[PDB]
Amino acid sequence: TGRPEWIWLALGTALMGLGTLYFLVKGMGVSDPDAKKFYAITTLVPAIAFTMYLSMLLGYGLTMVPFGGEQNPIYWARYADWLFTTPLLLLDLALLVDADQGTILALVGADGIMIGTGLVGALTKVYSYRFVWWAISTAAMLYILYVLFFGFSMRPEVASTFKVLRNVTVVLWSAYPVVWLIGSDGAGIVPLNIETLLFMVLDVSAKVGFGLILLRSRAIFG
Amino acid sequence: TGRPEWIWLALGTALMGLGTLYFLVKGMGVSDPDAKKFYAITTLVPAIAFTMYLSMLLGYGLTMVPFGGEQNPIYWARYADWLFTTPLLLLDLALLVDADQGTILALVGADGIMIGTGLVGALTKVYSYRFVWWAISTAAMLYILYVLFFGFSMRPEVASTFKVLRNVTVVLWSAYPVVWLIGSDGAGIVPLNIETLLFMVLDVSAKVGFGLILLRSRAIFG
Amino acid sequence: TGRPEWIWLALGTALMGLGTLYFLVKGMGVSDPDAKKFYAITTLVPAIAFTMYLSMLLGYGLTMVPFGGEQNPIYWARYADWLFTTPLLLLDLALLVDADQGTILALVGADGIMIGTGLVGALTKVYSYRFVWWAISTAAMLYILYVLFFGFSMRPEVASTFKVLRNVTVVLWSAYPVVWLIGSDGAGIVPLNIETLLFMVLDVSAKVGFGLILLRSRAIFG
Ligand SMILES: *C/C=C(C)/C=C/C=C(C)/C=C/C1=C(C)CCCC1(C)C
Numbered sequence: 001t002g003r004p005e006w007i008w009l010a011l012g013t014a015l016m017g018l019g020t021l022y023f024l025v026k027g028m029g030v031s032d033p034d035a036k037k038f039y040a041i042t043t044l045v046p047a048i049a050f051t052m053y054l055s056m057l058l059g060y061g062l063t064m065v066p067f068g069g070e071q072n073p074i075y076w077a078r079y080a081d082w083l084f085t086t087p088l089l090l091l092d093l094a095l096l097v098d099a100d101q102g103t104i105l106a107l108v109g110a111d112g113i114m115i116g117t118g119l120v121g122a123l124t125k126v127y128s129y130r131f132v133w134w135a136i137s138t139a140a141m142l143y144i145l146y147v148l149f150f151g152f153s154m155r156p157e158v159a160s161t162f163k164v165l166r167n168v169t170v171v172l173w174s175a176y177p178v179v180w181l182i183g184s185d186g187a188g189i190v191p192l193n194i195e196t197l198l199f200m201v202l203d204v205s206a207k208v209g210f211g212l213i214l215l216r217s218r219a220i221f222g
Numbered sequence: 223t224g225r226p227e228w229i230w231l232a233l234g235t236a237l238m239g240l241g242t243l244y245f246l247v248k249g250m251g252v253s254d255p256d257a258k259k260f261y262a263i264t265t266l267v268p269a270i271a272f273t274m275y276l277s278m279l280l281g282y283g284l285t286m287v288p289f290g291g292e293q294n295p296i297y298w299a300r301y302a303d304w305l306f307t308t309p310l311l312l313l314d315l316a317l318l319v320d321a322d323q324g325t326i327l328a329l330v331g332a333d334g335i336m337i338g339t340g341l342v343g344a345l346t347k348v349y350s351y352r353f354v355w356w357a358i359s360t361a362a363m364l365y366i367l368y369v370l371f372f373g374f375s376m377r378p379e380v381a382s383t384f385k386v387l388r389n390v391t392v393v394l395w396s397a398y399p400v401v402w403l404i405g406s407d408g409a410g411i412v413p414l415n416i417e418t419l420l421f422m423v424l425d426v427s428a429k430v431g432f433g434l435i436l437l438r439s440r441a442i443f444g
Numbered sequence: 445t446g447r448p449e450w451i452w453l454a455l456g457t458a459l460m461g462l463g464t465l466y467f468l469v470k471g472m473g474v475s476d477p478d479a480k481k482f483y484a485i486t487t488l489v490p491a492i493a494f495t496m497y498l499s500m501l502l503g504y505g506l507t508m509v510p511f512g513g514e515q516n517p518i519y520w521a522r523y524a525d526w527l528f529t530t531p532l533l534l535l536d537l538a539l540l541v542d543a544d545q546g547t548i549l550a551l552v553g554a555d556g557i558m559i560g561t562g563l564v565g566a567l568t569k570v571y572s573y574r575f576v577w578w579a580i581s582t583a584a585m586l587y588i589l590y591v592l593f594f595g596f597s598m599r600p601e602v603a604s605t606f607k608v609l610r611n612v613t614v615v616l617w618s619a620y621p622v623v624w625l626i627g628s629d630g631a632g633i634v635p636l637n638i639e640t641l642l643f644m645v646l647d648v649s650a651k652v653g654f655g656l657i658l659l660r661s662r663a664i665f666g
């Protein structure tokens with residue numbers, strides 16, 4: 001396309017679409033209920049991502065936001081995706097450790113705040129206000145990572161898998177507020193082409209990457 | 223109104239509104255918890271449909287989408303409805319057969335993809351791209367119907383009711399991708415007047431029709 | 445700001461932000477699972493409200509709706525908030541009395557209808573149609589309050605707390621359809637400045653006020 005970032009949105013689409021097929025196919029073979037749960041969640045995540053990367057690729061989820069001087073291109077389909085897939089990932093972590101209903105509530109709620117404010121700054125028109133919405137969104141991410149460390153004696157083919165996935169999450173999720181800040185969505189110090197490349201490498205890793213590690217573990221069984 | 227399809231949107235509103243009253247009234251008389259569940263779900267479905275048919279009737283959920291040459295009228299309130307009521311129907315089927323949490327997750331997730339992509343093609347501006355979003359949406363419908371047949375020894379006043387409702391669903395739900403394709407939302411081979419007539423006959427049948435069959439069955443009790 | 449209602453949206457933001465901090469901090473100290481549940485829900489409610497009051501304050505959730513003659517200012521961020529926080533409050537009441545899944549479904553569903561139609565009239569362009577959407581929205585509020593009285597033998601440090609919270613709810617929630625009618629969103633008999641003052645006093649009371657009463661009760665424990 002006439003857009004420099006098409007290549008990464010094209011590669012994003014393929015990879016997400018590839019992970020869903022692999023996981024669905026892999027998904028075929030399960031009988032253990034609990035294990036079913038982890039396939040249902042893990043497969044839907046890139047399934048959703050698949051639909052939003054295509055929408056950006058065909059250009060449906062792209063808008064112009066006016067701010068800091070001129071008109072700015074902003075992929076909003078990114079947040080609609082994150083809106084559903086991140087709560088879906090925390091749910092994988094949550095049911096892995098037999099979380100409490102109460103803690104599952106807080107995580108999900110804080111998550112919706114995270115993305116929700118992230119979307120608000122993405123579409124905000126006053127340049128300065130954006131980073132205030134960024135701060136709050138970041139403040140919720142700190143809560144979530146906090147909770148999965150200090151508020152989150154279980155069987156060991158579980159614990160060890162959880163510590164692994166959680167390390168992945170914390171490192172990946174932490175990159176997103178950094179990319180957004182340096183990117184076109186935030187400081188504008190990095191062009192849209194690179195900002196799109198960064199998110200795609202995170203998304204595939206945090207989704208397909210995360211799912212592969214997960215759906216192989218014996219942790220997901222009885 | 224100045225719109226040819228008012229009559230069907232007017233009849234849609236009455237019928238949906240009539241089913242909700244009947245089901246709520248009928249709903250009054252229940253004590254068995256589990257049965258309560260099926261009244262809660264079954265009544266809310268046309269309740270929601272009721273609100274969206276009126277919005278189309280008063281014209282709040284109507285927009286113009288430019289594509290394939292000219293400006294196209296598109297009722298988007300239809301998808302906001304389907305967004306909530308179809309997961310509500312699968313939930314009726316799901317709890318009827320004591321589905322697994324895992325399978326309830328997949329159905330609902332695939333459903334949101336179905337409608338979600340359906341909405342995206344409805345609002346897409348490049349004529350050709352629409353049917354690509356149609357294909358994917360259809361691909362999710364095939365998953366759902368699949369699952370309720372091959373991934374979905376239970377008491378017989380249940381099994382027989384389930385096979386019935388499920389037959390209804392498969393036949394009705396299959397009509398929707400056909401109507402959308404021939405209709406104004408898709409191929410434009412059928413005018414908006416007829417496309418509105420078709421969806422109304424499906425909606426009332428899949429909702430009120432489906433609910434009547436359901437809320438009479440002894441299957442919904444202990 | 446250049447807006448007369450800034451002061452109340454500024455005071456709304458502070459107070460909601462203050463309640464969340466207090467509840468989170470207070471939240472630190474819990475071990476009993478069930479009690480955790482009530483902190484998770486109760487704290488997220490003003491957390492969300494916090495984000496939407498700021499959005500109105502910075503002016504992100506403000507739009508112009510044309511009707512009854514001229515252009516009308518309409519804070520839509522108010523409904524996105526109510527969209528999530530009112531179901532969150534009913535859930536506090538619901539789990540307080542060990543509600544049935546079925547009844548929890550009806551309450552939440554009716555609630556989404558309430559706000560959902562409320563939003564539709566807020567954005568409707570034909571003056572008269574607004575109050576029709578107001579009527580239906582009100583009709584759902586009557587269902588909810590009904591249900592929490594006649595469809596909602598439990599331990600007494602519970603029952604007495606429930607009767608209390610419920611009295612709060614009914615009196616507060618009943619004020620909202622009145623404010624909306626006399627306000628700029630409805631009849632226009634009260635200016636936006638006063639209508640914004642009224643909602644802020646209700647919101648803080650129904651949220652922070654409601655939460656304080658709740659998170660002190662021994663009802664929330666085992
Ligand atoms: C499947 C995609 C994933 C796991 C995405 C994670 C995204 C985030 C952790 C988002 C973080 C953001 C902030 C905390 C600040 C505002 C900007 C965001 C939304 C990128």
Ligand SMILES: *C/C=C(C)/C=C/C=C(C)/C=C/C1=C(C)CCCC1(C)C
Nearest residue numbers: 307340359360363395398399402428
């Ligand atoms: C209460 C209304 C019901 C049960 C509606 C069902 C609608 C569908 C099965 C929708 C199907 C569609 C596709 C599979 C392709 C894209 C167009 C849609 C959304 C009409």
Ligand SMILES: *C/C=C(C)/C=C/C=C(C)/C=C/C1=C(C)CCCC1(C)C
Nearest residue numbers: 529562581582585617620621624650
């Ligand atoms: C946290 C905020 C609360 C508890 C708000 C409650 C709001 C309502 C009970 C809303 C009621 C309305 C109607 C019943 C008629 C239409 C206008 C509304 C949305 C204000």
